[PDB]
Design a protein around this ligand. Structure first.
Ligand SMILES: NC(=O)c1cccc2[nH]c(-c3ccc(O)cc3)nc12
Lengths: 341, 18
């Protein structure tokens, strides 16, 4: 039975997660084991660098956080939770944390390198994705949220910026900074304005249904080339979200608009993914009728777009950033705060 | 058009979390 298979898989996956969650892996590498190639990304968190593991010649993306800045920006819990979740999860569409360690000044997350770059760049370059192209990425998100939500995990930051394309043209969810273990409800104001569910904006207690609303935003942005709610300032974006009046481009198929009306649903008792049949309301929708869910999960489906492969450490799909020094203090900074990292 | 409104706006780049 196909439904008996999913239940057994999820039961084993929960058991694997709880074990790693209870006793997280720590200090599984050292900085001297790597060679820096190029800064791939920057921000308040710190930076992401393409690195080369000296012994193997293998390439990885290394996220480096400055402990002092993390403490100053009050992101200690956010940083610890990001790493604790990432080392405990295992799914084909989730970025793998290969190693983690810390020194006197920094925290290091060595992640699987995704040379295809961000979906964001590909989407802005092409303008908009066709419906079968958008469908292929959407299907991977559906299976990822089904996995995360079974572990009582809410993602909270779905957007093309947090999705990256691998060598096979398959996607990977990246940033686990806003991911949270939620048994019942949560109230924290977090996520990206364009992707926020009305209940977050309205300061209500919320759950995993916020991720299904964000899926509706993602699908709309992939298909149209722009989000369903946009404006110059976040405040003006929020007013559009709470209004809920969605306009669809004329090129959107009827099956697409229908699915979108059910995901971009203000009423929590009517939003797909949040009803009696849970994820199956989405999986069995007409828009996903040509989707072979097992073939997507098993990565057997031919991707609609395969990025230009030019070596394992190729950086052509990333923007250039100022190459800043990696300073390591002689003095141990914030030792107590990052004890569990 | 809707795309034109978006393109001319200040939110076409990578968006930060709040
Ligand atoms: N994996 C990459 O190739 C990569 C490249 C550029 C920026 C990146 N940010 C992340 C990432 C992953 C997990 C996480 O909790 C936070 C950030 N991974 C990359």
């Amino acid at each position: 039975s196909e439904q008996e298979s999913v239940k057994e898989f999820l039961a084993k996956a929960k058991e694997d997660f709880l074990k790693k969650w209870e006793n997280p892996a720590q200090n599984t590498a050292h900085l001297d084991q790597f060679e820096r190639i190029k800064t791939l990304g920057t921000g308040s968190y710190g930076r992401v660098m393409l690195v080369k593991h000296m012994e193997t010649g293998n390439h990885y993306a290394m996220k480096i956080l400055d402990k002092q800045k993390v403490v100053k920006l009050k992101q200690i819990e956010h940083t610890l939770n990001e790493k604790r979740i990432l080392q405990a999860v295992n799914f084909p569409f989730l970025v793998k944390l290969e190693f983690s360690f810390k020194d006197n000044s920094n925290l290091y997350m060595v992640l699987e390198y995704l040379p295809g770059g961000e979906m964001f760049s590909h989407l802005r370059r092409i303008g908009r994705f066709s419906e079968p192209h958008a469908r292929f990425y959407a299907a991977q998100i559906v299976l990822t949220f089904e996995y995360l939500h079974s572990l009582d995990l809410i993602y909270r930051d779905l957007k093309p910026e947090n999705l990256m394309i691998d060598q096979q043209g398959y996607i990977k969810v990246t940033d686990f900074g806003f991911a949270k273990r939620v048994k019942g409800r949560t109230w924290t104001l977090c996520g990206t304005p364009e992707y926020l569910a009305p209940e977050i904006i309205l300061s209500k207690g919320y759950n995993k249904a916020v991720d299904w609303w964000a899926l509706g935003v993602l699908i709309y942005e992939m298909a149209a080339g722009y989000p369903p709610f946009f404006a110059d300032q976040p405040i003006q974006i929020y007013e559009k979200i709470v209004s809920g009046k969605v306009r669809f481009p004329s090129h959107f198929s009827s099956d697409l608009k229908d699915l979108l009306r059910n995901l971009l649903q203000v009423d929590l008792t009517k939003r797909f993914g949040n009803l009696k049949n849970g994820v199956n309301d989405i999986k069995n929708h007409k828009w996903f009728a040509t989707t072979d869910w097992i073939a997507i999960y098993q990565r057997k489906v031919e991707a609609p777009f395969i990025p230009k492969f030019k070596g394992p450490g190729d950086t052509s799909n990333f923007d250039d950033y100022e190459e800043e020094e990696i300073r390591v203090s002689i003095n141990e900074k914030c030792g107590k705060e990052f004890s569990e990292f | 058009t809707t795309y034109a409104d978006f393109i001319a706006s200040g939110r076409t780049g990578r968006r930060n979390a709040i």
